[PDB]
Amino acid sequence: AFKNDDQKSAYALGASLGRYMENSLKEQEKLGIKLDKDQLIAGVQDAFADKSKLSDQEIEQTLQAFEARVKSSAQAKMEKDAADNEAKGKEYREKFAKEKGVKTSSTGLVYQVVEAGKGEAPKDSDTVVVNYKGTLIDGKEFDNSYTRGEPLSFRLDGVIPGWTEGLKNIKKGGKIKLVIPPELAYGKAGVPGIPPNSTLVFDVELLDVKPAP
Amino acid sequence: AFKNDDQKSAYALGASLGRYMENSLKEQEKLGIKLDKDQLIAGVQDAFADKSKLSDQEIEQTLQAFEARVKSSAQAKMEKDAADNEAKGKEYREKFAKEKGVKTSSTGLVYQVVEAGKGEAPKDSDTVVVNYKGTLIDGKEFDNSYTRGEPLSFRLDGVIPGWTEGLKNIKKGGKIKLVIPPELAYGKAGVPGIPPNSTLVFDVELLDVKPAP
Numbered sequence: 001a002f003k004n005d006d007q008k009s010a011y012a013l014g015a016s017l018g019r020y021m022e023n024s025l026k027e028q029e030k031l032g033i034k035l036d037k038d039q040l041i042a043g044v045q046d047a048f049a050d051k052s053k054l055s056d057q058e059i060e061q062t063l064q065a066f067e068a069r070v071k072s073s074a075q076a077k078m079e080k081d082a083a084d085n086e087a088k089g090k091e092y093r094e095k096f097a098k099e100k101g102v103k104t105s106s107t108g109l110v111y112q113v114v115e116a117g118k119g120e121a122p123k124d125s126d127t128v129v130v131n132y133k134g135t136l137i138d139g140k141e142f143d144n145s146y147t148r149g150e151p152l153s154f155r156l157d158g159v160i161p162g163w164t165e166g167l168k169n170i171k172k173g174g175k176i177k178l179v180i181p182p183e184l185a186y187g188k189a190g191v192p193g194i195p196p197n198s199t200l201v202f203d204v205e206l207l208d209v210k211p212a213p
Numbered sequence: 214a215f216k217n218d219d220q221k222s223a224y225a226l227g228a229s230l231g232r233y234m235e236n237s238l239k240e241q242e243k244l245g246i247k248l249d250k251d252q253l254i255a256g257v258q259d260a261f262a263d264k265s266k267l268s269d270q271e272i273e274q275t276l277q278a279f280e281a282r283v284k285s286s287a288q289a290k291m292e293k294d295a296a297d298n299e300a301k302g303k304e305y306r307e308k309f310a311k312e313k314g315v316k317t318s319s320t321g322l323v324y325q326v327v328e329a330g331k332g333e334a335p336k337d338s339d340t341v342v343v344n345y346k347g348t349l350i351d352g353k354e355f356d357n358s359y360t361r362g363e364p365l366s367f368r369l370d371g372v373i374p375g376w377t378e379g380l381k382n383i384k385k386g387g388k389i390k391l392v393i394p395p396e397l398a399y400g401k402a403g404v405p406g407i408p409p410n411s412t413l414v415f416d417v418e419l420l421d422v423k424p425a426p
């Protein structure tokens with residue numbers, strides 16, 4: 001429905017801008033910001049027609065303020081999600097602790113030894129080799145050793161405490177399920193890939209234990 | 214007429230995009246491209262509403278093609294303006310040549326010695342010091358020595374020929390008006406600040422003549 005290039009290009013140009021906006025909004029939505037969509041289009045129209053209800057200076061100071069509002073809204077979201085994640089997490093940890101063979105350490109680690117292991121147990125300065133699979137309590141995975149095409153080996157005092165504590169509950173050749181509260185893991189802050197305050201679930205197999213070189 | 218930040222920011226966002234487009238169009242217009250304005254808005258609306266009549270791939274290949282069309286349209290404009298500028302220029306040169314004291318060199322330089330000068334006349338390897346004022350035939354200035362807060366000094370074989378030829382028609386202390394056709398100047402191409410095929414008009418005063426060091 002374009003009769004010429006002038007029309008097609010113009011439309012393509014608009015379309016690409018319309019998609020640009022649509023995608024920016026979705027980005028904003030994930031930070032807890034929902035912009036009035038009709039106003040957004042009304043701004044485009046008004047300005048294009050030289051009838052913006054905001055002055056160029058206003059537009060510019062408002063966008064600057066919006067930037068601040070985004071950083072700030074993200075912060076608030078982070079904290080909201082942090083509260084929800086620990087609420088869910090606490091409930092999950094509490095159900096799991098009621099299952100067979102499950103123990104809760106004074107630190108709050110919930111663990112289940114599945115195979116005792118016959119070697120010895122690692123200590124803080126030891127390098128461990130492990131197979132593992134980790135997920136969030138909704139069951140979605142963030143790490144799989146397995147799929148990575150290989151197991152991992154690392155010194156034990158480097159990793160998060162929930163883990164270092166957990167792997168000390170078994171010996172070489174052992175298997176253990178760890179349910180780690182956020183404070184033994186990535187905290188309320190969290191890290192890229194792990195949401196704020198999340199409880200982590202790991203199946204771990206300890207393949208080997210080596211002393212610090 | 215915003216009842217809250219959600220509305221104001223959204224509008225500001227649109228407005229800034231609407232201005233962005235408006236200004237891009239004006240840029241395109243100077244390259245000889247006039248986009249259908251209703252289609253531009255229709256693209257923004259359709260895509261925003263998830264009903265673009267173009268696929269994302271189409272949008273992208275069309276914009277790429279538009280880029281080519283811009284480079285190409287600019288070229289065509291340049292040549293059109295080149296033809297108009299020489300048409301105007303030829304007429305101006307022809308009127309001026311009919312005035313008192315005006316001569317046309319075999320090269321097409323049109324010149325008018327206003328004060329003969331009493332020194333000697335520069336030669337190609339000489340450094341000249343000059344006052345000058347240059348404009349296009351519509352009378353708009355691109356250079357003023359005068360206003361620059363100073364006169365200029367340069368070797369004479371470096372500058373455009375129309376000039377080097379012209380300043381040889383007077384001696385130190387002389388004054389001359391030069392009307393230079395494009396081929397003795399910046400050509401059909403032209404240079405930043407000088408439109409394609411423009412005839413240049415200079416009032417020049419030769420303050421000094423020095424030999425190449």
Ligand SMILES: [Cs+]
Pocket residue numbers: 097098099100101102103
């Ligand atoms: Cs138990």
Ligand SMILES: [Cs+]
Pocket residue numbers: 310311312313314315316
């Ligand atoms: Cs004449």
